[PDB]
Design a protein around this motif. Structure first.
Motif, PDB file in Angstrom:
ATOM      1  N   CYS A 164       0.833  -1.194   0.000  1.00 52.23           N
ATOM      2  CA  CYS A 164       0.000   0.000   0.000  1.00 52.23           C
ATOM      3  C   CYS A 164       0.871   1.249   0.000  1.00 52.23           C
ATOM      4  N   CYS A 167      -0.250   2.961   3.872  1.00 53.54           N
ATOM      5  CA  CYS A 167       0.072   2.239   5.094  1.00 53.54           C
ATOM      6  C   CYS A 167       1.145   1.176   4.900  1.00 53.54           C
ATOM      7  N   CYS A 186      -6.792  -1.565  -0.735  1.00 54.57           N
ATOM      8  CA  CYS A 186      -5.941  -2.053   0.340  1.00 54.57           C
ATOM      9  C   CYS A 186      -6.777  -2.771   1.390  1.00 54.57           C
ATOM     10  N   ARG A 188      -5.577  -3.319   4.519  1.00 52.16           N
ATOM     11  CA  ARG A 188      -5.218  -2.810   5.839  1.00 52.16           C
ATOM     12  C   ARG A 188      -5.947  -1.508   6.156  1.00 52.16           C
ATOM     13  N   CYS A 189      -5.681  -0.455   5.383  1.00 54.30           N
ATOM     14  CA  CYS A 189      -6.288   0.848   5.619  1.00 54.30           C
ATOM     15  C   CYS A 189      -7.506   1.108   4.744  1.00 54.30           C
ATOM     16  N   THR A 191      -7.887   2.071   1.826  1.00 53.86           N
ATOM     17  CA  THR A 191      -7.774   3.080   0.784  1.00 53.86           C
ATOM     18  C   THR A 191      -7.887   2.429  -0.589  1.00 53.86           C
ATOM     19  N   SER A 194      -4.667   2.053  -3.575  1.00 54.36           N
ATOM     20  CA  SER A 194      -3.436   2.366  -2.866  1.00 54.36           C
ATOM     21  C   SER A 194      -2.430   1.224  -2.907  1.00 54.36           C
TER      22      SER A 194
END
Ligand code: ADP
Ligand code: ADP
Ligand code: MG
Ligand code: MG
Ligand code: ZN
Ligand code: ZN
Lengths: 629, 212, 590
Positions: A164, A167, A186, A188-189, A191, A194
């Motif tokens: 990403c 992040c 993404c 994780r975050c 977005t 990303s």
DNA sequence: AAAAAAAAAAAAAAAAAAAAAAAAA
DNA sequence: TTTTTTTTTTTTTTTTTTTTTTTTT
């Protein structure tokens, strides 16, 4: 589990995974080849199942490959053979699973980098690929050919490592069906867009492109040779060099091609290529290649003792000479020379001496009228040794015999391509009609015969290709007839420098002898209506190359010195081929070659005497005189 | 050549064979093809081609017993080779064998027969050479330096390989006229063919071993 | 913000090694090396991998198996190591250079399994492209919202930010040079062309490799991309370049002297004072060649050479002696050429017809990455300040012999091709081997007739050595004895007083000397030239002109250089005159 | 008459300048 | 819908090789 890019019915097929799996396991657990010959299968306890011993060998060495002969499946179960050939994509993974289960059931504590993948080979040979049909698409096939060229490694992705941009969360996507599913969001975050692909952190396999010339045994009238494209994946890269003669077993692939390398539109016509599954370098009609000699486990102890016993017979040399080309009659000296050429001299290391490379091969020039059986010997040797090549004088040029540059019409890149002489690097180049050769292309042979290198300096690249070839040249006398009125050197019609390079110039003349004519007529007529077998001569030569490394001795050295002085005195006449220091070296080679026939491992008086005798018999020095003619 | 206009050159047309119409015609084969004259879209100018439907090999390319069993049947074929050429009884009998050819033996010795008609001008050498072309199944008639070099052997033309008269005449009869006045390189190439029956090329862009 | 824990731990351990590792003396050697990192034009610290193994074996293993994914962290560790000590610019970046990697890999071994991890390879440099500034991370402006996306990392490709978060003056650049190499001869498999992979060099080590050099590159194999298609090509990224076979263990005479170690200088000085060094060098350089003392002396003086000079009017005085060898076959001519090639660095060997004009002199191609053009160096250029061994010279085409004559004339090659002109320098001596016309040397003719060389080519050959194969029995016995002894005892039987490496170092040191010509030596030269001209007053193999005076001066200069003398004594002039006189052979006739 | 060197043919590769169409936003 | 980057095509030139031709022994 290294993925292989080479690779109830599943879909539109006749195979169910469980059935193929169980059938392959059974075949692997209870298969014995009845007509198996102990020599044909070295180091294998014949009475017990063959492939279980193969698995034991894998456990010992660790090579995670199982060369399964498709003919064994054909005999044991023809239905499984049909399934395999028709659907290599589905069957081979099933075989991999089966062999892995068998090899981890037994030997449950073995350690390997990856699981064991089967490699079917010797599938029913496709005599001519042109006879292949679109109905034969995506099916296993075995062909035989010569490798014209091999390209550099191409890295092909298997797992994309994304990170990403915000992040920096790392996930690894795996190739699904030739495409990689970019996350586009993404994890994780959360977005959007990303996740960016990272190249160097990803996982790649290898892919090598090999342009191969086939030698189809079914040659319809007017059919030109055919070249095809092979892909080698993840282990078979650089398993075959240019000039090698191979049997390639692989999947007949047809892929779309885009009308341009940039637009997504594709021609209705596809273009086909083979994904290599197995390479077989062994051939019963030729000698062993250098690779086969390299590996130690090729000669069973019994076969080694048989060869040793053969070497102890007094007529070993003559028996071997009589074996070459049985259809050619009483050319004993010529066949002995060709035998010494096949054995070759010791390959020595002269880097420490500051001298450079030393030629250890042997070059034989047969000078004789067109009627005599010259070209037959050249063609036989060309059809006997591996990495052999053939040329016919005016049909070749210097650039084509050394190297050139061309735009590869599959990558559209200007790349360098080897010539005929390089292709036979560790083999033999049979140059027929040597006389009918323009001086321009002849000049090249000087370096290839003395240095064994070829230093090209052209716009493309400046470099020296190593060529350790042995030249077997055939030439006609000037005026196409060996008129006895002209001296030997005058009749040969070649520059003295070049004739010095050759270490054996056999004069094939026609003695007007009635007994010889009658015997030759008998031989030819018998041939028209029709020993030491190939399987033994081939093994003898392979073993001699592998183990025997003759070294000169005191008596041999003294005899060589005296013989060179005698040669310098004898050849000092006007019309006879003058003797140079380069000839002394020749004797060494010949002596070593003969010492290699006897498996002596040390050159002594007998070997040097035989070399001198063979050289003198060539050029008919005994039948000549100071008044040459 | 019999249907080209007087002052023009022969015209070539494209044929796209498919299905069971492939591998029926080789280069140099006289063929009658019945297909469809259809254009391929590129004003709306459009190229053309023939979509092959029926391919037939004609004339030399085309694909009772009492007389054959006769004692003189050997003479009859000989006397029937270019009957308008008077005399030369023996020569025609020798050419007859060239058409039949010997028998290949592989204990590999060729089974072909090579006959060279050398003589003074105007002794019907060329007419017999031309007659054999119109009779032999596979044949090529090359005269002097009109078709030399790559005309006999092959050449590289993706890059494909195109054979010359020898290749097109493979397993046939290549009628060479004025062999003496042939290019020295071409004579060297023939030397290989009449003994090796192959054409070993090691040129810049070519490295093969044809079958002739 | 996920942290690559492996990379962070590697950085911490590497920084600890940098600030803790001590040399034999006990001082932090890398601190001293970093001391110089402050000065501009200096942003790379060379760290020996042996030290890294000795300090933290686990860290070294992690770096070797994860070199690419940790290299930025090693650079960051170095930046922290240097910043806290001095006042380096904040924006200045630093790179870590590794060397002395214990194991080496072949170009054929660079499989995909070696991607993105440390490896050292050896190769021969084919050509070097120019040096450019390279963008590693800068600034991006969105044309839709003017939101500046900042410090996007470029991966060998112009990589805009994939999505808006919603210039040059504010960016960081690093030197970048794409230099192409190719596989070495020893590594070549049977019947295969050499492999070439374009290695990429960055700051500091951006010109350490020149065309024609044998170099070891230490770094990482990487993949460069060449709905979208993922077409990748392998490329080597090297963090350090060093010669494969270093000449000195440690350009002007003193600089070379300090470049050497203590033992190397001891050897060089000892042999400089070694009386009879001439014969010792002759024997050691050619142990396997019997007799032919004159040719050995000639090629030795050639390896040393004269002293180039420039005239007040601008005329260039040739200061490099050429040599030619002509005679009967099997006289060990190509062996002399091969000896010179394999021994002398910057020595390039070619053939008669195997080399075209462009590949023999020079060529031009256009840089694939910019608007500039790069110059493919031909054989003559690679011999710059070296030697070019042309075997079978007589067979060379005239279109090429004209170029060789040009090189001998003005030492330079002028090119006007492919949109670029250039005048490049070729200060090369030429060792030619030419077969006599008819394949045998005829003693009843002048040298002009015995060979097929054009008069201009022969004119500027300082020395012609004739090797006739007199059919003498004593000489044949000696030759046979030497050859058989060579082939019986391969590694041994060669007792050369000085190793080829020692002779290489001595040659490199002595080449810097520029001997003078004292008045006594000048008078001796005048008298010797007078006598040598009187020689031509029976006939000689070729007339004697002032060019022979030039050759004698150059040979005296080379002789002085051999002993590292600073003034040409009369003895050197005498030796040069004797050698040149012997090179001239009487044209005997019935 | 035959070989050696030169010249020309010819085919493949590169530059490039400009007009038109497909994909992107 | 309107831009833009590519796609082509259409000329032209350049370089390597081969083949053809000319000069000499
Ligand atoms: N024996 C013959 N019988 C019939 N016609 C002949 C004979 N010999 C020559 N001719 C005639 O001579 C003409 C030219 O012959 P041609 O084949 O050119 O002779 P060559 O080729 O032997 O010089 C032909 O039209 C042919 O009809
Ligand atoms: N005087 C000599 N001493 C040692 N070896 C020699 C001598 N003369 C000739 N030779 C040997 O003869 C071989 C052939 O010589 P070479 O240099 O190829 O001849 P040319 O000079 O014609 O090329 C060489 O390998 C060399 O070892
Ligand atoms: Mg006629
Ligand atoms: Mg030589
Ligand atoms: Zn994220
Ligand atoms: Zn934006």
């Amino acid at each position: 589990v290294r993925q292989r890019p080479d690779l109830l019915v599943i879909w539109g097929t006749d195979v169910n995974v469980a059935a193929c799996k169980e059938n392959f396991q059974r075949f692997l657990q209870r298969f014995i080849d009845p007509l198996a010959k102990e020599e044909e299968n070295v180091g294998i306890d014949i009475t017990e199942p063959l492939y279980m011993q193969r698995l034991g060998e894998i456990n010992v060495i660790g090579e995670p490959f199982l060369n399964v002969n498709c003919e064994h499946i054909k005999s044991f179960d023809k239905n499984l053979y049909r399934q395999l050939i028709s659907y290599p994509q589905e069957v081979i993974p099933t075989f991999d699973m089966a062999v892995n289960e068998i090899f981890f059931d037994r030997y449950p504590d073995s350690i390997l980098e990856h699981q064991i993948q089967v490699r079917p080979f010797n599938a029913l040979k496709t005599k001519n690929m042109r006879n292949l049909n679109p109905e034969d698409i995506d099916q296993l096939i075995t062909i035989s050919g010569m490798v014209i060229r091999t390209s550099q490694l191409i890295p092909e992705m298997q797992e994309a490592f994304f990170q990403c941009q915000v992040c920096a969360h790392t996930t690894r996507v795996e190739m699904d069906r030739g495409r990689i599913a970019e996350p586009s969001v993404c994890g994780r975050c959360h977005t959007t867009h990303s996740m960016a692909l990272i190249h160097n952190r990803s996982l790649f396999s290898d892919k090598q492109m090999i342009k191969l010339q086939e030698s189809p045994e079914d040659m319809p009238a007017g059919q030109t040779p055919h070249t095809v494209i092979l892909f080698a994946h993840n282990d078979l890269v650089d398993k075959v060099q240019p000039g090698d003669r191979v049997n390639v077993t692989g999947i007949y692939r047809a892929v779309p091609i885009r009308v341009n390398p940039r637009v997504s539109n594709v021609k209705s016509v596809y273009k086909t290529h083979i994904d290599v599954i197995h390479y077989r370098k062994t051939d019963a009609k030729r000698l062993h290649g250098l690779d086969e000699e390299a590996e130690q486990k090729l000669f069973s102890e019994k076969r080694v003792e048989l060869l040793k016993e053969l070497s102890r017979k007094p007529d070993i040399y003559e028996r071997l000479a009589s074996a070459l080309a049985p259809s050619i009659y009483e050319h004993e000296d010529i066949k002995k020379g060709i035998l010494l050429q096949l054995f070759g001299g010791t390959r020595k290391d002269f880097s420490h001496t500051g001298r450079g490379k030393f030629r250890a091969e042997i070059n034989i020039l047969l000078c004789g009228d067109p009627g005599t059986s010259k070209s037959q010997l050249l063609q036989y040797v060309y059809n006997l040794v591996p990495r052999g090549q053939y040329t016919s004088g005016k049909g070749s040029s210097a650039v084509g015999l050394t190297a050139y540059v061309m735009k590869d019409p599959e990558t559209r890149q200007l790349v360098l391509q080897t010539g005929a002489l390089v292709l036979s690097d560790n083999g033999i180049c049979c140059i027929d009609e040597f006389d009918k050769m323009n001086e321009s292309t002849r000049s090249v042979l000087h370096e290839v015969m003395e240095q064994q290198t070829l230093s090209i300096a052209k716009a493309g690249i400046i470099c020296q290709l190593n060529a350790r070839t042995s030249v077997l040249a055939a030439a006609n006398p000037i005026e196409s007839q060996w008129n006895p009125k002209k001296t030997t050197i005058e009749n040969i019609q070649l520059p003295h420098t070049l004739l010095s390079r050759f270490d054996l110039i056999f004069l094939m003349l026609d003695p007007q002898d009635e007994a010889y004519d009658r015997r030759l007529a008998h031989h030819l007529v018998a041939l028209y209506y029709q020993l030491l077998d190939m399987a033994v001569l081939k093994d003898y030569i392979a073993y001699a190359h592998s183990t025997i490394m003759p070294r000169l001795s005191e008596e041999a050295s003294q005899a060589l010195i005296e013989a060179y002085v005698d040669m310098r005195k004898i050849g000092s006449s006007r019309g006879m081929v003058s003797a140079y220091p380069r000839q002394l070296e020749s004797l060494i080679r010949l002596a070593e070659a003969h010492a290699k026939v006897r498996l002596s491992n040390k050159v002594e008086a007998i070997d040097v005497e035989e070399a001198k005798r063979l050289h003198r018999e060539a050029l008919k020095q005994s039948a000549t005189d100071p008044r040459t003619g | 050549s019999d249907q080209v206009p007087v002052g023009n050159i022969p015209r070539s047309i494209t044929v796209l064979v498919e299905g069971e119409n492939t591998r029926i015609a080789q280069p140099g084969d006289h063929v009658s093809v019945t297909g469809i004259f259809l254009p391929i879209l590129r004003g709306l100018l459009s190229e053309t081609y023939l979509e092959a439907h029926r391919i037939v090999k004609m004339n030399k390319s085309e694909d009772e017993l009492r007389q054959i069993a006769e004692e003189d049947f050997y003479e009859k074929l000989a006397a029937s080779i270019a009957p308008e050429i008077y005399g030369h009884e023996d020569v025609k009998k020798a050419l007859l064998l060239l058409l039949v050819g010997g028998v290949d033996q592989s204990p590999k010795i060729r089974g072909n027969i090579n006959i060279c008609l050398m003589g003074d001008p105007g002794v019907a050498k060329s007419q017999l050479l031309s007659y054999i072309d119109r009779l032999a199944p596979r044949s090529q008639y090359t005269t002097g330096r009109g078709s030399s070099g790559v005309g006999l052997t092959a050449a590289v033309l993706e890059l494909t390989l195109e054979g010359g008269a020898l290749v097109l005449a493979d397993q046939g009869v290549c009628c060479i006229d004025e062999f003496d006045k042939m290019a020295e390189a071409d004579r060297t190439a023939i030397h290989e063919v009449m003994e090796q029956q192959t054409i070993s090329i090691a040129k810049a862009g070519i490295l093969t071993t044809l079958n002739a | 913000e996920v942290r690559d824990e492996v990379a962070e731990k590697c950085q911490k351990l590497f920084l600890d090694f940098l600030e803790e590792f001590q040399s034999s003396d006990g001082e932090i050697k890398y601190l001293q090396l970093a001391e110089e990192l402050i000065r501009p034009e200096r942003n790379t610290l060379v760290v020996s991998f042996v030290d890294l193994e000795q300090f933290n074996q686990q860290l070294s293993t992690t770096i070797q198996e994860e070199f690419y994914r940790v290299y930025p962290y090693l650079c960051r560790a170095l930046k922290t190591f240097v910043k806290d000590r001095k006042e380096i610019p904040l924006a200045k970046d630093f790179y870590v250079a590794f060397q002395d990697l214990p194991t080496r890999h072949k170009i054929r071994e660079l499989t995909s399994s070696r991607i993105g991890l440390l490896t050292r390879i050896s190769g021969q440099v084919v050509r070097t492209h120019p040096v450019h500034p390279e963008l590693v991370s800068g600034t991006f402006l969105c044309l839709d919202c003017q939101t500046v996306i900042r410090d996007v990392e470029q991966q060998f490709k112009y990589t805009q930010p994939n999505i808006c978060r919603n210039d040059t003056n504010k960016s960081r650049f690093v030197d970048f040079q794409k230099v192409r190499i190719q596989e070495t001869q020893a590594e070549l498999p049977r019947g295969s062309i050499p492999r070439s992979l374009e290695v990429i060099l960055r700051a500091e080590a951006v010109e350490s490799a020149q065309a024609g050099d044998k170099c070891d590159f230490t770094g990482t194999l990487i993949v460069v991309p060449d709905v979208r298609d993922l077409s990748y090509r392998l490329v080597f990224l090297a963090c350090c370049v060093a010669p494969t076979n270093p000449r000195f263990g440690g350009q002007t005479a003193e600089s070379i002297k300090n470049q050497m170690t203590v033992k190397e200088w001891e050897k060089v000085f000892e042999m400089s004072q070694d009386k009879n060094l001439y014969h010792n060098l002759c024997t050691s350089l050619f142990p396997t060649i019997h007799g032919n003392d004159e040719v050995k002396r000639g090629v030795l003086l050639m390896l040393f050479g004269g002293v180039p000079k420039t005239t007040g009017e601008g005329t260039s005085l040739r200061g490099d002696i050429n040599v030619c060898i002509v005679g009967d076959p099997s006289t060990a001519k190509s062996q002399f050429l091969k000896h010179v090639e394999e021994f002398s660095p910057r020595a390039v060997y070619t053939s008669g017809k195997a080399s075209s004009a462009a590949g023999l002199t020079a060529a031009v191609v256009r840089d694939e990455e910019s608007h500039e053009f790069v110059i493919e160096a031909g054989a003559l250029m690679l011999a710059d300040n070296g030697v070019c061994c042309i075997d079978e010279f007589d067979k060379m085409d005239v279109r090429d012999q004209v170029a060789i004559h040009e090189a001998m004339e003005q030492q330079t090659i002028s090119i006007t091709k492919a949109g670029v002109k250039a005048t490049l320098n070729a200060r090369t001596s030429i060792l030619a081997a030419a077969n006599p016309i008819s394949g045998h040397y005829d003693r009843s003719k002048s040298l002009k007739q015995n060979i097929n060389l054009s008069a201009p080519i022969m004119s500027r050959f300082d020395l012609f050595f004739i090797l006739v194969d007199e059919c003498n029995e004593v000489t044949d016995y000696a030759i046979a004895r030497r050859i058989v002894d060579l082939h019986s005892r391969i590694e041994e039987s060669i007792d050369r007083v000085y190793s080829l490496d020692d002779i290489r170092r001595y040659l490199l040191f002595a080449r810097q000397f520029k001997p003078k010509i004292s008045k006594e030596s000048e008078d001796f030269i005048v008298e010797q030239y007078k006598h040598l001209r009187q020689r031509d007053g029976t006939k000689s193999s070729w007339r004697i002109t002032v060019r022979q005076l030039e050759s004698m001066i150059r040979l005296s200069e080379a002789m002085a250089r051999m002993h590292c003398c600073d003034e040409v004594q009369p003895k050197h002039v005498k030796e040069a005159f004797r050698l040149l006189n012997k090179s001239i052979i009487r044209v005997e006739t019935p």
